[PDB]
Every structure is written in C-alpha cells, then in structure tokens.
Amino acid sequence: LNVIKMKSSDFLESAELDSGKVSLAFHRTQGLMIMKTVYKGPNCEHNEALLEEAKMMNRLRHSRVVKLLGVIIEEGKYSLVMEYMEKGNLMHVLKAEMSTPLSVKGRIILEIIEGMAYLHGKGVIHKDLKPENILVDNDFHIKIADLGLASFKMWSKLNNEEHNELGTLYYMAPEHLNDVNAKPTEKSDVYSFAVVLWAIFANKEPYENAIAEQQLIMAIKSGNRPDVDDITEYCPREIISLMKLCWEANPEARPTFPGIEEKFRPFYLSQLE
Amino acid sequence: LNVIKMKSSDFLEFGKVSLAFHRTQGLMIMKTVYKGPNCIEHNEALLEEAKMMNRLRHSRVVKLLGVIIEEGKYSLVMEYMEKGNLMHVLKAEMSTPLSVKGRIILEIIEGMAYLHGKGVIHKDLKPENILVDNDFHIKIADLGLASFKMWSKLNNEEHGTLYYMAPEHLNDVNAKPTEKSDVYSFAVVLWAIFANKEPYENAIAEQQLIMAIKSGNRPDVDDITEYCPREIISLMKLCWEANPEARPTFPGIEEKFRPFYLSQLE
Numbered sequence: 001l002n003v004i005k006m007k008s009s010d011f012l013e014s015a016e017l018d019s020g021k022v023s024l025a026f027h028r029t030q031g032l033m034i035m036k037t038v039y040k041g042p043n044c045e046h047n048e049a050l051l052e053e054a055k056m057m058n059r060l061r062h063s064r065v066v067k068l069l070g071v072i073i074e075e076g077k078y079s080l081v082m083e084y085m086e087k088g089n090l091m092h093v094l095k096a097e098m099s100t101p102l103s104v105k106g107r108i109i110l111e112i113i114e115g116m117a118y119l120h121g122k123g124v125i126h127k128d129l130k131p132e133n134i135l136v137d138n139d140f141h142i143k144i145a146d147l148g149l150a151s152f153k154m155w156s157k158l159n160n161e162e163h164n165e166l167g168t169l170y171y172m173a174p175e176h177l178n179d180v181n182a183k184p185t186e187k188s189d190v191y192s193f194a195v196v197l198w199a200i201f202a203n204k205e206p207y208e209n210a211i212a213e214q215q216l217i218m219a220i221k222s223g224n225r226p227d228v229d230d231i232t233e234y235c236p237r238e239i240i241s242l243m244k245l246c247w248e249a250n251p252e253a254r255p256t257f258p259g260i261e262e263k264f265r266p267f268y269l270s271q272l273e
Numbered sequence: 274l275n276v277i278k279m280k281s282s283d284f285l286e287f288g289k290v291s292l293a294f295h296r297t298q299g300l301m302i303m304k305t306v307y308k309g310p311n312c313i314e315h316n317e318a319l320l321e322e323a324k325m326m327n328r329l330r331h332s333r334v335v336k337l338l339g340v341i342i343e344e345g346k347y348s349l350v351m352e353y354m355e356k357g358n359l360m361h362v363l364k365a366e367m368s369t370p371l372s373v374k375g376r377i378i379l380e381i382i383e384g385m386a387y388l389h390g391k392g393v394i395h396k397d398l399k400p401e402n403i404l405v406d407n408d409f410h411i412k413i414a415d416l417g418l419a420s421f422k423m424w425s426k427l428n429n430e431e432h433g434t435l436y437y438m439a440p441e442h443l444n445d446v447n448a449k450p451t452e453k454s455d456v457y458s459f460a461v462v463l464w465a466i467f468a469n470k471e472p473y474e475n476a477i478a479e480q481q482l483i484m485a486i487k488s489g490n491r492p493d494v495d496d497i498t499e500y501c502p503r504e505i506i507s508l509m510k511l512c513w514e515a516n517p518e519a520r521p522t523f524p525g526i527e528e529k530f531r532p533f534y535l536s537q538l539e
C-alpha cells in the first residue's frame with residue numbers, strides 16, 4: 001500500500017512514445033512497463049511531498065484505473081512507473097483498420113462508467129477525462145489515467161519547475177473554456193464523458209471543420225456540440241440520447257455516473273452484450 | 274441523495290420478504306419488519322440507520338430503494354433479484370458452468386472491495402446474503418441486518434447457521450469483527466460454489482463442530498467432486514487461515530484473481 005521506490009538500474013528503458021517524455025521500459029525481473037520521466041536536470045526540494053503525492057496516487061486502486069507500480073526519485077531525475085496497456089489509448093484503438101464491434105464499444109463505455117464511479121466514489125474530480133487518458137489492453141479492457149497530472153499539483157509543476165532538460169479543449173466543459181482560474185466539479189467530468197461517447201461512435205476527434213481556436217471556444221460556450229450526423233456507423237438511440245443529456249449547457253442538468261451506470265448497465269446487458 | 278419515504282398505498286398488496294409493485298417505479302422486494310403496536314419514540318434512529326443503509330450504492334450490493342415509516346408498519350424496500358440466493362441457484366437442475374462460477378466469484382470480490390472501501394464490515398457474508406438476477410449477476414445483501422441494530426431488533430420481537438463464521442468469533446461474541454472476518458466467510462463461499470452444497474454435512478452436533486473448527490477444521494476439499502481450478506483451492510485455503518493476519522485483503526484477492534479469471538476462465 002506504500003509506494004515501490006525503483007532504481008534506474010532496474011530498467012533498460014526505450015525511446016519515447018507519441019501517445020505520451022513517456023516511454024516503454026523493461027524491468028529486469030517484473031517485465032514490461034510504462035515510464036513517465038517528469039524531470040531531468042540538476043539537483044532540487046519537494047522530495048517528501050512528491051513521495052507523499054505518489055503514496056496519494058497509489059491509494060486509488062481499481063480494475064478501471066491505471067496502477068502506479070513505482071517511482072524513480074534520484075539525484076536530478078524524477079519518474080512515474082505504471083502498468084503496460086498494450087493497445088495504447090482509446091483514440092488510437094478507434095482509428096485502427098481492425099473493426100471495433102458494437103458489443104466491445106458498449107463494454108468500453110460501461111468500464112469507463114465503472115472507473116469514473118470509483119474516482120467520484122473516493123471524492124476525486126478527474127478534471128481531464130479524454131480518450132488519451134483512457135488506455136486499452138490486448139483483451140480490449142480499459143483503465144483511466146491522469147497523464148496530465150491534473151490531480152497531482154507538485155508533480156505537474158515539477159514538469160515546468162526549473163532546469164528541466166525534457167489537446168484538452170475538445171473534452172473540456174464550456175463553464176471552464178477560456179477561464180484562467182476555474183474550479184472543476186464532478187459534472188465537468190460528466191461533460192467530457194459525453195464527448196468521449198461521441199468519439200467512440202465517430203472513430204475520430206470532434207470539431208474537424210473548426211478553423212481557429214477562439215472560434216471553437218466561443219462556439220462550444222454558445223452551445224455547439226459534436227455533429228451527431230457525422231456518426232456514419234450505427235449508434236443506438238439510447239446512447240445518442242445519453243451523450244446529449246451529459247453535454248447539457250447547465251452543469252446541474254447533467255446526470256451523475258451512479259445515475260448513468262443504473263440506466264446504461266441493464267441497456268448494455270440486454271441490447272449490446 | 275437522501276432516503277425515499279415511500280407509502281404502503283404506493284404498493285399493490287430475513288423477515289417477511291414479499292415481492293411488491295410500486296405504482297410508478299415497478300417491481301421490488303419489501304421486508305416488512307414490524308406489524309402490530311406503535312413505537313414512534315425511536316423513529317428518528319431507524320431513519321438514521323436508513324440514511325446509513327442508503328449511502329451504499331454499487332453494482333454488486335443490493336440498493337435500498339426506500340423505507341415505509343407508518344403507524345404500526347415498518348418496511349425496507351430493496352431491488353428485486355429473480356433467481357433468489359446463491360445456494361438456491363447452485364442446487365437447481367441446470368448445471369451452472371465454470372466460467373459463470375468464475376464471474377460470480379469476481380463480482381463477489383468487486384462488491385466486498387466496495388463495502389470495505391466505505392469502511393463496512395459485513396460480518397455475515399454467506400450464500401443466503403448473495404442474490405442472483407436473471408443473467409446470473411450477483412449483489413451482496415445484509416438480510417440478517419448485521420450492521421443495522423435497531424431494524425434487526427425490530428425484525429425479531431413478537432408478531433443463523435455458523436458454517437461461514439471465522440473461528441475468532443466462534444464462542445467469542447465480544448471479539449470485534451475486522452475486514453479479515455469477512456475474508457474467512459468468502460473462503461467458505463468459494464468452497465460451497467464448487468461443492469453445490471453447504472459444508473460439514475456429516476458433523477455430529479454444532480457444539481462439537483464449533484470446537485473442531487476452532488482447532489483448525491475446514492470444509493472437506495474431497496467433497497468437491499466436479500472440477501475446481503487448483504489456484505482457487507489455494508485461494509480458499511489462504512482465506513480460511515486460522516490467523517486473521519495470514520488472510521489477504523479483498524484488494525489483495527482482486528489483483529491475483531482478476532487476471533487469473535480473464536486469462537483462464539473468461
């Protein structure tokens with residue numbers, strides 16, 4: 001339940017990944033893993049706080065959240081070590097030439113609901129749910145990640161701290177768009193989820209026809225949402241309903257993940273599984 | 274957020290469990306605990322235990338849908354489970370395949386992990402308290418009202434087998450239950466799932482059987498005639514260890530069992 005303090009010698013770590021300075025690394029005994037090197041540079045401070053924030057992020061253990069296996073914390077380099085998800089992130093899986101069946105897409109959605117229900121269950125606001133932060137194993141089971149380090153302030157600042165040698169907008173609720181200092185709520189995560197449902201049936205990012213960013217922000221704040229007609233393949237009307245309900249302008253008019261799970265699970269089981 | 278105060282008029286019409294029809298929301302199970310005289314002085318305490326009951330919401334625990342608090346009728350209203358309890362499902366003429374028994378075990382682990390996550394000790398996990406819907410998905414129940422004292426008192430005033438009980442609580446009723454108390458119970462549940470019956474069938478008497486269990490007696494593994502994976506036999510032995518400390522946590526179980534389930538049984 002305390003963090004595993006791993007050494008640099010324990011790995012033969014690879015080149016970067018574009019789905020990240022995130023890299024695949026080979027542990028000498030425990031085998032294949034994912035490593036997020038946060039810092040490289042001279043010695044610095046906050047060592048106890050980072051190791052406590054690692055302990056904090058090690059607390060959250062579920063079948064649908066990515067597990068911290070350990071951390072590297074040495075003289076002038078800081079890294080997070082996490083379990084290997086073979087098929088990469090959700091958006092990578094949807095774009096692949098291999099067909100993703102309806103039943104699988106259904107299960108993926110239930111597994112995300114399960115995972116979000118867990119984090120909210122522990123009083124965690126994700127703040128940055130998006131297909132990047134949804135990883136997929138070889139059996140097409142998923143786990144939720146915080147690779148932005150949204151919920152871990154000391155690690156997130158460490159990336160841009162000082163002497164460091166080493167996306168969101170589409171899934172961010174309109175209340176927080178163009179807001180320098182916004183407080184994200186649980187219902188912020190519910191909006192993100194709605195855009196994720198759309199992406200799962202679109203097999204692409206939303207807002208492809210946007211030209212400038214200030215155009216897209218002002219559009220989404222004025223009530224624009226992903227084009228439902230741009231869903232070419234079959235998407236059940238129950239899920240089309242659900243994503244419209246979850247990307248409501250009014251935060252309070254959105255449901256909660258317990259509320260979603262209660263409706264979606266029996267629908268999934270009866271119609272999609 | 275808070276509990277729903279339902280009326281008896283809103284319905285058609287372990288405790289007097291009746292299946293009842295809510296006039297709008299549809300079919301439910303109602304546990305009418307008290308029918309007769311009036312006890313309105315302690316209604317606040319029951320409604321405070323109800324709030325406590327209402328806070329536990331998971332896919333693998335039975336949900337309180339609402340409660341009836343009237344002059345001389347007191348009921349818990351909870352979600353319907355078509356196939357009844359686990360022991361009833363195992364004893365049916367339809368053989369329940371290995372893959373399903375595997376999934377059942379994962380769903381129990383999921384549910385127990387949730388309750389422990391909310392600081393809940395079940396204290397009386399057993400096949401009777403494990404209910405099964407039409408697609409063989411399970412939800413854990415507290416029909417004995419082990420964790421709800423005022424309702425449990427009310428249940429059995431006018432108008433309990435030991436096979437799944439950890440040895441620390443056998444002949445010690447003051448011993449505080451821990452998480453590891455539930456983990457022993459779970460071990461005996463694993464056995465029953467592959468046995469398709471209650472253990473200790475050829476015990477002489479319960480006084481003597483209790484003393485046997487305290488001295489290290491466990492269910493007969495040779496009584497499992499049908500196939501049981503060896504790593505599940507290993508798991509149930511590790512979970513029914515004499516020493517509470519020597520048993521794994523439900524988190525500990527989940528992390529070993531889930532990838533085993535997925536790779537070998539799913």
Ligand SMILES: CC(C)(C(=O)N1C[C@@H]2C[C@H]1c1cncc(C#N)c1O2)C(F)F
Binds near residue numbers: 068080124147
């Ligand atoms: C940071 C790390 C290890 C990670 O994914 N997680 C740590 C724990 C579980 C998982 C995670 C996922 N979503 C939200 C939170 C919160 N709060 C969270 O916290 C990885 F992204 F580097």
Ligand SMILES: CC(C)(C(=O)N1C[C@@H]2C[C@H]1c1cncc(C#N)c1O2)C(F)F
Binds near residue numbers: 349351388393395418
């Ligand atoms: C009593 C009631 C409603 C019920 O199953 N539960 C109430 C809530 C969820 C579920 C439950 C199950 N296991 C343990 C606890 C605890 N603590 C529990 O508490 C039913 F048996 F009538």
